[PDB]
Amino acid sequence: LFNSEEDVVKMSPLPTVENQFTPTTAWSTSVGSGIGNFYSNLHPALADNVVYAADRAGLVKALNADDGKEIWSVSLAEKDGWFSKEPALLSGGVTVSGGHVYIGSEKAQVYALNTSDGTVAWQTKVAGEALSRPVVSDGLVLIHTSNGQLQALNEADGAVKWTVNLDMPSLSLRGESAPTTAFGAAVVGGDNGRVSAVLMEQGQMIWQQRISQATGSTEIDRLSDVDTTPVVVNGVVFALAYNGNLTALDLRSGQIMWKRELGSVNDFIVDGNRIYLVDQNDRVMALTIDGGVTLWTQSDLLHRLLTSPVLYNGNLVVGDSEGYLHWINVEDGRFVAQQKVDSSGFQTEPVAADGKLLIQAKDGTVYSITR
Amino acid sequence: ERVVYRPDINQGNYLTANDVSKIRVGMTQQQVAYALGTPLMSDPFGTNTWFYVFRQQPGHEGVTQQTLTLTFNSSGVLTNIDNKPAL
């Protein structure tokens, strides 16, 4: 019927579904339509034993953990988005500290909903789309946004501590540069292909170092799950450009002590001296801190829209936005387990929490993966 | 001719009374052409004779014309603001 009408495309699926510790979700309590086709984060924060989790529908839940049961469920509104009074469609993921479920919107908003009812204990607008999850630290709800702005908002009552542009991308090379505080600097990357550390006191540029190019005529990866967000394991500062070129900069000057400009790393953690990273090939691999010495790699993972490789249930778990979870041999690259618990899958990082692996997929959003 | 109206004979390019009073006998062609410009008909035969001339007939009700020519000398200095009417 509908086959002969349309045209064709291409991608790369998952090989070697492994189950050596046979995985499963422990609860299933999904928020709704989860991350969506905006560059969005809906990262479920689990506090009060409650997965405060949101989707790109404005709907924020309170999925009380060990069953994900609803403590509360609110749907947030926007104020300038297309006209006004529109659902939040959250770009920033759920941050929770105190009675404050901080979620950032795709239109302009960054919230903080009280963690008993989800009533917005404050919301504070950021300039354009909150490119980052609302990173909440030191009285500052630090967001790097669509306009390249490190925006710090007051985490108790809502008040813009500052909003400072660092690396405005071209149109908006959508880079979650999410501002991590290190050495007095909220270290927050560059969406056009840079990395910065910016002083956490009021947003003073400690350094911004250009890492890789911009997307458009200097063609680098837009298709990367951009984690311009600096994972600052000590001041060899591990971070990414817009394509995800891993770079290890100085914390006070940006001196790139080594880089995987060679890489265009999508999702990376620096597990001590083991930079467990989803590469541009979506190869899960381990790198050092003083170099990108490939302590191991993985070709079992190869072009799935992966999450971050996180150690849980004895193995390095990495889901994807194809729903395949993958428990990686942490010592070398091998699928120990695979859980295809979604098929729209997780554009949020696997929250190895509650004794589970809490996730947010796009359709079957909040599960909690076990083995 | 019993016609009261048909598509009318028409023209433009004829000096306003401003354009006549903008200039004087003695005024050079360029000095004449400062706000009069050039006509669309001058004299290739004799002197500078700048014919700014109208033509019109409003439906066989008497044909109209405004032949406002500027006879200069060959130095271009105006010698005649020659403004002939209809017929």
Partner: protein
């Protein structure tokens, strides 16, 4: 075109089909020559042989290409003037041509778009190449052509006589009078200037034009 052959293979199979009159199979091998050998030693002649092929295949703008592709690319021949001939010779037949001739209506009062170009090239022949055998047509092919410019321009003086825009009669005529020194349509433009002047009551100015008739009686 023939494939990547030696040039004189392609030049011979160009040249025979000129002598065969197989001008397409000349162009098949005049240009497959110039495909890999436009630096052929005869590529100046090939360009002329292209005009020999094109215009005798009646490919007049393609000749006009190879006419200019002679003078631009390989002008090294004394048939630049032939090219200046064939430029207009393209441009003369490029302007006024129709199937209306068997019924008996005009072509020369029409617009002279390419005919003004043939007016140029046959002038550029008799000016820029006045030595040439090609000037012989070219001198003749200015004479009708300025009258073809005249009888085109006279038609507007003819029409604006009908319009009653009597300035606009003289606008063509005195322009034509300034244009054409010998064409009859200009001598026939000539009284319309006086005629229009008399409707505009420039009767004395009209008789300036009437004494031209006393001189263009001669």
């Amino acid at each position: 075109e023939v494939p990547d052959n030696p040039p004189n293979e392609i030049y011979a199979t160009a040249q025979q089909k000129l002598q065969d009159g197989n001008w397409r199979q000349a162009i098949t091998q005049l240009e497959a020559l110039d495909n890999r050998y436009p630096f052929g030693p005869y590529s100046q002649q090939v360009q002329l042989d292209l005009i020999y092929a094109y215009y005798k295949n009646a490919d007049l703008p393609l000749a006009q290409a190879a006419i200019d592709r002679f003078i631009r690319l390989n002008p090294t021949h004394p048939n630049i003037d032939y090219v200046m001939y064939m430029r207009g010779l393209t441009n003369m037949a490029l302007d006024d041509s129709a199937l209306q001739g068997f019924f008996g209506v005009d072509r020369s009062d029409r617009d002279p778009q390419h005919a003004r170009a043939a007016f140029s090239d046959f002038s550029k022949l008799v000016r820029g190449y006045p030595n040439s055998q090609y000037t012989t047509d070219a001198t003749k092919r200015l004479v009708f052509l300025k009258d073809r410019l005249a009888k085109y321009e006279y038609s507007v003086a003819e029409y604006y006589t009908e319009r009653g825009a009597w300035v606009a009669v003289v606008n063509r005529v005195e322009g034509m009078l300034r244009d054409y020194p010998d064409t009859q349509a200009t001598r026939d433009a000539l009284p319309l200037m006086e005629n229009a002047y008399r409707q505009m009551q420039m009767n004395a100015q009209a008789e300036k034009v009437a004494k031209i008739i006393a001189a263009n009686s001669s």
